[PDB]
Amino acid sequence: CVVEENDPIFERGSTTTYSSFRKNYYSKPWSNKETDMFFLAISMVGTDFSMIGQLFPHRARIEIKNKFKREEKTNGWRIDKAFQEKRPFDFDFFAHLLQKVLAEEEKRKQK
Amino acid sequence: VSGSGGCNFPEYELPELNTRAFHVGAFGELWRGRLRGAGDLSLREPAADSDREDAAVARDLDCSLEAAAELRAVCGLDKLKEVIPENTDLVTLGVRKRFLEHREETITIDRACRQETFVYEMESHAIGKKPENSADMIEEGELILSVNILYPVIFHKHKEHKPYQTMLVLGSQKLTQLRDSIRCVSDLQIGGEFSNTPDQAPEHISKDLYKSAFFYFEGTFYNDKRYPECRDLSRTIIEWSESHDRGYGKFQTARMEDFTFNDLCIKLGFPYLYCHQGDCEHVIVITDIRLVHHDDCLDRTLYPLLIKKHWLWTRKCFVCKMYTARWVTNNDSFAPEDPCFFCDVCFRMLHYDSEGNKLGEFLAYPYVDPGTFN
Amino acid sequence: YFKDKVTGVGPPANEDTREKAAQGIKAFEELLVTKWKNWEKALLRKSVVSDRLQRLLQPKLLKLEYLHQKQSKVSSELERQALEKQGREAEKEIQDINQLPEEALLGNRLDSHDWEKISNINFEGSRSAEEIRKFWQNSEHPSINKQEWSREEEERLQAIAAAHGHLEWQKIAEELGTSRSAFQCLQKFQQHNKALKRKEWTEEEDRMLTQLVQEMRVGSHIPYRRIVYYMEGRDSMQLIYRWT
Amino acid sequence: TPPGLQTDCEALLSRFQETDSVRFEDFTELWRNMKFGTIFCGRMRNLEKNMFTKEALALAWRYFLPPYTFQIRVGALYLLYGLYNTQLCQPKQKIRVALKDWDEVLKFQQDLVNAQHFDAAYIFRKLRLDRAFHFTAMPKLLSYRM
Amino acid sequence: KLFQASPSVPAKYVEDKEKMLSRTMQLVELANETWLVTGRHPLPVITAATFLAWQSLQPADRLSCSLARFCKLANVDLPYPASSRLQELLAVLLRMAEQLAWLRVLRLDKRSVVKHIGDLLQHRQSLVRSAFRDLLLPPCMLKSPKRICPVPPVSTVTGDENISDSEIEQYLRTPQEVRDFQRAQA
Amino acid sequence: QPSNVLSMAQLRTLPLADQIKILMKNVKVMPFANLMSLLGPSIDSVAVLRGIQKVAMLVQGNWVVKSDILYPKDSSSPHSGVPAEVLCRGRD
């Protein structure tokens, strides 16, 4: 037996209910430097959504897919420009840049 | 049911804003047992005096029989210097100079403190007031309670409710005395209609027609049943409290002719309310309570004193602007607005001929100015 | 939190309140009269002109809608042409009513106007029906001469008032021909009148003044306004000498 | 609360702390230098000066709180004594004391009388002799309108 | 629950059911004839209409309220876009208030237009006809689109058999890149 | 723990004004002495008079209940359905 664990809540009094029919999937927004680092990760790795999602702990796979699709639809010129230039795979400096982005977003949240 | 929960040592519920409820009647015993309080007779004397002082002090607190501390006396009375506040470096001297300069700028004389002279005279009414007889002298340790009421609405609408009066009452007195001592202009108003006959004399004011009056102190409604004409206004307030689960506990009802201020377990500074004449409301704030002193009024029956009657602006006649009006008109034929004011000589000439015949169609009501009690 | 300790969302009412309010025992809740503002004047003007324009347009609009319905129901060509001509006439009427200057559509001071509609819709219940009615009848109206006197009409005013007996100031003001309300001229009449003042002081009034002082004087201050209220004829300016 | 008095009290607290002992001689020596009893008369005596001295006595007795040091307590007590004894105006403004405030003064006078300070006890003796106390439930009055 | 004077609602908010129903029916008909039921959900439009009706029934004591306050008092979950829909309907009222002479002289706004809603419902036909003679579309396309359905360039060519071959060399992974990929997710 | 629903015992527990009102509503015709006898000798005559003057009128030395007391503003004629104002005017 529970003792003072739950609180009373009034919900759905059986009246005419509004037909929502909308599931607004919460997605974290995109910053400027975040967009730049996403573009450089694309230019370094390609269009492999798995590897991009692995190196983006603050993001999701479906969010990366939506961003890539919107970029291909809007800024195809910048997409091709990033795809033409290549850069070798970096791991340590990539982690340093991740820590820098963490510090930057922490300072932004402090503001 | 006895006294509600409360300790005679008031703890602040909110810092410097209010305090918890407590039995105010127990203060007159607690403070009188903790301190003897003897000396409420003004028996100060206008050698042998030094001998009595020695026989008292050297036996109560002091151990030495030498009168060496009496130097302090000559330091207080003899070394006391009709002087000018100058030639010294103090901040209080600075603010005094600032006040004197602000006075010399615009202020002409001291004859500008009528609002302060009111309180000064109402406090002087409480000093030097000898009792009527020996059996009427107030006993030592009497509890005295101050109260501030906020009745009217003629003051600032776009501001807080500061400007009204303050009263003072005794503890040993009954609640009926405080009930009948509260003066309100609504009791002086007259019912009926007077446009048909302005010469009709007031037959019964609203004070005698409706004597209903009750108090509210922590769910305790004290009704009055001295006269068989009054009614119990608390019959509905309880129902509206028990008809639905509003969170308000059960309220205890009692009479007024058998309850004293001692059993009033109330908070100091909390905004209660007194109600009478159906919906006539008075927000009440109990600010201070204290034992009796040797400078207060000695007459017990003559101490429902209104220690501060706030000033009120009498409504002038809208026609002549030189007299106070006594009649309020409605549906007038010549007035610039409906709520116009008229005095006797103006209300007579407005819609009445030489013989007093009613001219035109209009309504009139006897407006008693609030300045009657002010 | 100023009215009552019970003033929640919905305040209750006792039974004695009906007896208090039914016998005409109004004490303080009816004395909250306030002045006027420029935006209130503009709102009143707009409300009255809109009411008059609506009263003038409603029959024309109803007739135009009826003509539209009839021409949509009728099938004859001659009847259709007649209805079209009548609708053109109605449209021209609506046009000349809409292009009417804002001086003739104001009516008169006692013109028929719905004051409750103006009070509860336009003023949003901020002003009573009578409070805007009487304000538009004499206070705010273009037929009211706002010019001050030239010290030439008070003589004829008092002459007519003495010849008539000071009974009805309305007829006196109408016969004087000032194009102003009776209350607007009576104030200046009583301000120029000499009967409001007093004369050399007697002895019996000193008894009453001393009684009023010994009964309601406080300290060094004397409430001479109470003396003005009780003693008739004495103003507030020169009465203070009675104790100077 | 008067703003200038909140600084004047802290100013006189410097000379109060300057005293070396609690004997009543130091106050008599300071009286020749810091004459605090100059405004007691002024150029006008009315309700203005009445409220002035009332707030003065109130804010001076406020410094008699337990957290204050013993020398500050003696200084405040002697200051209140002098301010009350120098009341030459028509009203006799007595210091307002609360019920909770009258708890520290008991052990204070006990320590004064046990330490053989005859002057410190005679001060309170004469203060009681003048009947200069306003016994109130609270040291200050306040409302909820503000 | 606005029809019954329950203790949970003040008596000032109580109204008649028939009058409110008729006003809401007139308002939803106005919305239907002004393209406010096509595409959008009906329930938010119905809520906006009944809110405007409740406000117009007593603007003296109900104009200071809002849609959230009304939905909280009525104990009904308010639709999210309803307020926006309300705004659109309010705009329609403005487009009607500009046609009536007394209303266009009164110079109403989004707030003071509710008190005359009944008048707008009296001659709504001519008002909406005059408004449409000056249609309704979503605000996303009412930004004066100068380029409507831009024609893409005709690039259906495919060369002869192969345009180029360096693209395949660009899309393939190098052995170093393959080793880096194998090491990243090893 | 008709209008004659309340008995005499329940009536005596009500305030004097309510007692006079209910008695004038039930009987509609009664002298002052009969009213004083029914209410009780322990009640002052001035209070009873002031109470009956509010809900009754004097007709040939007797007291007749006012028209508005019998017919409230929301009531109507049970035989014709006319408003209560016309009934009050006719009774007056």
UniProtKB/Swiss-Prot annotation, chain A:
It comes from the Eukaryota. It is found in: Nucleus. Isoform 2 is highly expressed in cerebellum. Induction: By Epstein-Barr virus (EBV) resulting in the stimulation of the EBV EBER genes. Phosphorylated by CSNK2A1 during mitosis, resulting in its release from chromatin and suppression of polymerase III transcription. Residues 22-72 form the Myb-like domain. It is linked to Deafness, autosomal recessive, 112: A form of non-syndromic, sensorineural deafness characterized by postlingual progressive hearing impairment. Sensorineural deafness results from damage to the neural receptors of the inner ear, the nerve pathways to the brain, or the area of the brain that receives sound information. Component of TFIIIB complex. The TFIIIB complex has two activities, alpha and beta. The TFIIIB-alpha and TFIIIB-beta activities are required for transcription of genes with TFIIIC-bound internal promoters and PSE transcription factor-bound external promoters, respectively. The TFIIIB-alpha activity complex is composed of TBP, BDP1, and a complex containing both BRF2 and at least four stably associated proteins; YY1 facilitates the formation of TFIIIB-alpha activity complex. The TFIIIB-beta activity complex is composed of TBP, BDP1, and BRF1. This is Transcription factor TFIIIB component B'' homolog. The chain holds residues 274 to 384 of 2624 of the full protein.
From Swiss-Prot, chain B:
InterPro entries: snRNA-activating_su3. One of its GO terms (cellular component) is snRNA-activating protein complex. Disulfide bonds: none annotated. GO terms for molecular function: bent DNA binding; DNA binding; RNA polymerase III general transcription initiation factor activity; RNA polymerase III type 3 promoter sequence-specific DNA binding. PANTHER family: SNRNA-ACTIVATING PROTEIN COMPLEX SUBUNIT 3. Belongs to the SNAPC3/SRD2 family. This is snRNA-activating protein complex subunit 3. It comes from Homo sapiens (Human).
From Swiss-Prot, chain D:
Residues 1-146 are annotated as: SNAPC3-binding. The chain holds residues 3 to 148 of 368 of the full protein. This is snRNA-activating protein complex subunit 1. It is found in: Nucleus. Part of the SNAPc complex required for the transcription of both RNA polymerase II and III small-nuclear RNA genes. Binds to the proximal sequence element (PSE), a non-TATA-box basal promoter element common to these 2 types of genes. Recruits TBP and BRF2 to the U6 snRNA TATA box. It comes from Homo sapiens (Human). Part of the SNAPc complex composed of 5 subunits: SNAPC1, SNAPC2, SNAPC3, SNAPC4 and SNAPC5. SNAPC1 interacts with SNAPC3, SNAPC4 and TBP.
Curated annotation (Swiss-Prot), chain F:
Coiled coil: none annotated. It is found in: Nucleus. Transmembrane segments: none annotated. DNA-dependent RNA polymerase catalyzes the transcription of DNA into RNA using the four ribonucleoside triphosphates as substrates. Specific peripheric component of RNA polymerase III (Pol III) which synthesizes small non-coding RNAs including 5S rRNA, snRNAs, tRNAs and miRNAs from at least 500 distinct genomic loci. Assembles with POLR3D/RPC4 forming a subcomplex that binds the Pol III core. Enables recruitment of Pol III at transcription initiation site and drives transcription initiation from both type 2 and type 3 DNA promoters. Component of the RNA polymerase III complex consisting of at least 17 subunits: a ten-subunit horseshoe-shaped catalytic core composed of POLR3A/RPC1, POLR3B/RPC2, POLR1C/RPAC1, POLR1D/RPAC2, POLR3K/RPC10, POLR2E/RPABC1, POLR2F/RPABC2, POLR2H/RPABC3, POLR2K/RPABC4 and POLR2L/RPABC5; the stalk composed of two subunits POLR3H/RPC8 and CRCP/RPC9, forming a structural mobile part that protrudes out of the core and functions primarily in transcription initiation; and additional subunits homologous to general transcription factors of the RNA polymerase II machinery, POLR3D/RPC4-POLR3E/RPC5 heterodimer and POLR3/CRPC3-POLR3F/RPC6-POLR3G/RPC7 heterotrimer. It comes from Homo sapiens. The gene is POLR3E.
